C-alpha cells in the first residue's frame, strides 16, 4: 500500500487489536477505487492458523446488505414490489394484524415490532407460519423501527418466492456470481473449511448455529477480498453490467425512513456526509420513531453508508462514501464493541479523504 494508507491503518488497528484483545483481523481499504489489504493474528488459535486474505469470517447482520440487494434485484426484475402486502407472497398468513404490513415494512424493521430473534424452537415451515401468525405487533405499521432478524429475514424469504429459486440459489446466481464473489458462502463447502476462521466468545472457539431464516438475516461468510469487491460494487453500481443488479444496489441505498440523523435502506443504513463518529453511534432492544421519506430519496453519493454485524464469535463492519470513492471493511473473530469499530473506521476514512 501507499505509505499514507499503510500508516493510518496500522496506527489505528494495532491499538484496537490490543485494547479489544482481538485474536485475528482482516482489513480492506478501498481508496480511489482500488483495494488494499491488511491481516493480523489468528483464524484458529489452537491450530495456529493465521488470518490471510483468504480467511472466511462470519458477517452476522452485514449479511443483510446482501439480502437487501437481492431484494432490490427482485424489485427491478418486476418479481416483487415493496408496496405489496406481505400476504401477497404468503397467503397462508391470514391473521388480521398482517393487514397493511408491506414488504417495505419487513425490509426496514418497521412492521410494528417483530421480535429481534426467531425463537430457537421455530425450525420448520409450519413452525415459522405459526410464529408469524401468533405475533402481536406493539405498534401500527410504519411508525417505529425495531432492528430485528425476524423482519429482514422474512423479507429475504418472501422476496425470492416468485423466482422459483431457493434463497441460497437466488443469492448465488443473481448476486455472488455476477459480482465474482467466489469465496462468499451461505453454507461453507467442505473444500473451504480450511479457510473458515473460528469465532471466539469468552475464549471459546465458536461458529454460528443453524436457525430459522439464518441465511436471510445473518448467515453469510466471506473473505476480506470478496468483501472489498462487495464495497466496490456498492460504491459504483452503475458500472455493473447486469441491469437489474445495478438497480438492486441503487434501491438498497435509497432512503426510506429517518431516525435522528440515520436513514434506513434495504440492509444498508446511511447518514449524510460529512458526519462525526458520535453521530454515527450495547442496547438489546432500541425502539425508535421513524419518519417516512415520501418518496424515498435515491442513493445519495454524499453519504456515509454502513453496516455493523455480529455473531457470537465475530464482529464485522463495512462503511463507504460514494462521493469519495472510499471504503473500508473490518472483519474480526471476536464480537467487540460497535463504537470501537466505528471510531477506527472513521479515523481511517477521515484521514484519507
Q: Resolution of the experimental model in angstroms, please?
A: 1.5
1-353: which CATH number, 1.10.30.50, 3.20.20.30, 3.40.710.10, 2.40.50.220? 3.40.710.10
Q: Which three cell numbers stand for residue 232?
A: 466496490
The Cα–Cα gap between 90 and 255 comes to: 26
Is there a cis peptide before residue 274, judged by omega within 30 degrees of 0?
A: yes
Query: Quick check: is 61 catalytic?
Result: yes
The angle formed by the CA atoms of residues 9, 312 and 137, to the nearest 5 degrees, is 115
3-state SS of 78-113 is: CCCCCCCEHHHCCCCCCCHHHCCCEHHHHHHCCCCC
DSSP-derived pairing of the beta strands 199-201 and 24-31: unpaired
Q: For residues 134 and 144, what is the distance between their CA atoms, to the nearest angstrom?
A: 20
Residue with cell 441491469: 243
Where is the binding site, in residues?
61, 117, 147, 149, 310, 335
Q: How many CA atoms lie within 13 A of 348 on its CB side?
A: 32
Which of 63, 4, 10 lies closest to 32, judged by CA?
4
C-alpha cell at 66: 446482501
DSSP of 212-258, one letter per residue?
TTHHHHT--EE-HHHHHHHHHHHH-GGG-SSHHHHHHHHHHTSEEEE
Length of the chain: 353
Cell 460514494 belongs to 322
| Helix orientation angle between 338-352 and 3-20, rounded to the nearest 10 degrees | 170
Is the CB of residue 56 less than 8 Å from the CB of residue 192? Answer: yes
Q: How many CA atoms lie within 13 A of 215 on its CB side?
A: 17
Rg (the chain; Cα; Å): 19
* Cβ neighbours of 94 (radius 10 Å): 10
Cα–Cα distance list, 202 to 18, 312, 324, 336 (Å): 16, 10, 39, 11
Q: Which of 61, 63, 222, 316 is catalytic?
A: 61
Between CA 171 and CA 217 the distance in angstroms is 13
Q: Return d(Cα 195, Cα 253) in angstroms, integer.
A: 31
- Going by DSSP bridges, is the β-strand pair 288-289/221-222 parallel, antiparallel, or unpaired? unpaired
Nearest to 219 by CA among 58, 108, 54: 58
Amino acid at each position: 500500500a501507499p505509505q499514507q494508507i499503510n500508516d493510518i491503518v496500522h496506527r489505528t488497528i494495532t491499538p484496537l487489536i490490543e485494547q479489544q484483545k482481538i485474536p485475528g483481523m482482516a482489513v480492506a481499504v478501498i481508496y480511489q477505487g482500488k483495494p488494499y489489504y491488511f491481516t493480523w493474528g489468528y483464524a484458529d488459535i489452537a491450530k495456529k492458523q493465521p488470518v490471510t486474505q483468504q480467511t472466511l469470517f462470519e458477517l452476522g447482520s452485514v449479511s443483510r446488505t446482501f439480502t437487501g440487494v437481492l431484494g432490490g434485484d427482485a424489485i427491478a426484475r418486476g418479481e416483487i414490489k415493496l408496496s405489496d402486502p406481505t400476504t401477497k407472497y404468503w397467503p397462508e398468513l391470514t391473521a388480521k394484524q398482517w393487514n397493511g404490513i408491506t414488504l417495505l415494512h419487513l425490509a426496514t424493521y418497521t412492521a410494528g415490532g417483530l421480535p429481534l430473534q426467531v425463537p430457537d424452537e421455530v425450525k420448520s415451515s409450519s413452525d415459522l407460519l405459526r410464529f408469524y401468525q401468533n405475533w402481536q405487533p406493539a405498534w401500527a405499521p410504519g411508525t417505529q423501527r425495531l432492528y430485528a432478524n425476524s423482519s429482514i429475514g422474512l423479507f429475504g424469504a418472501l422476496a425470492v418466492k416468485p423466482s422459483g429459486l431457493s434463497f441460497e440459489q437466488a443469492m448465488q446466481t443473481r448476486v455472488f456470481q455476477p459480482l465474482k464473489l467466489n469465496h462468499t458462502w451461505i453454507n461453507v463447502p467442505p473444500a473451504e473449511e480450511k479457510n473458515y476462521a473460528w469465532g471466539y466468545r469468552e475464549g471459546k472457539a465458536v461458529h454460528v448455529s443453524p436457525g430459522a431464516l439464518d441465511a436471510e438475516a445473518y448467515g453469510v461468510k466471506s473473505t476480506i477480498e470478496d468483501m472489498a469487491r462487495w464495497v466496490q460494487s456498492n460504491l459504483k453500481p452503475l458500472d455493473i453490467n447486469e441491469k437489474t443488479l445495478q438497480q438492486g444496489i441503487q434501491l438498497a441505498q435509497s432512503r426510506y425512513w429517518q431516525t435522528g440523523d440515520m436513514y434506513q435502506g434495504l440492509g444498508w443504513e446511511m447518514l449524510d456526509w460529512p458526519v462525526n463518529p458520535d453521530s454515527i453511534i450495547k442496547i438489546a432492544l432500541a425502539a425508535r420513531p421513524v419518519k417516512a421519506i415520501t418518496p424515498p430519496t435515491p442513493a445519495v453519493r454524499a453519504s456515509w453508508v454502513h453496516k455493523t454485524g455480529a455473531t457470537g464469535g465475530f464482529g464485522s463492519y463495512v462503511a463507504f462514501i460514494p462521493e469519495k470513492e472510499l471504503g473500508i471493511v473490518m472483519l474480526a473473530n471476536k464480537n467487540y464493541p460497535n463504537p470501537a469499530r466505528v471510531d477506527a473506521a472513521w479515523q481511517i476514512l477521515n484521514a484519507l479523504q
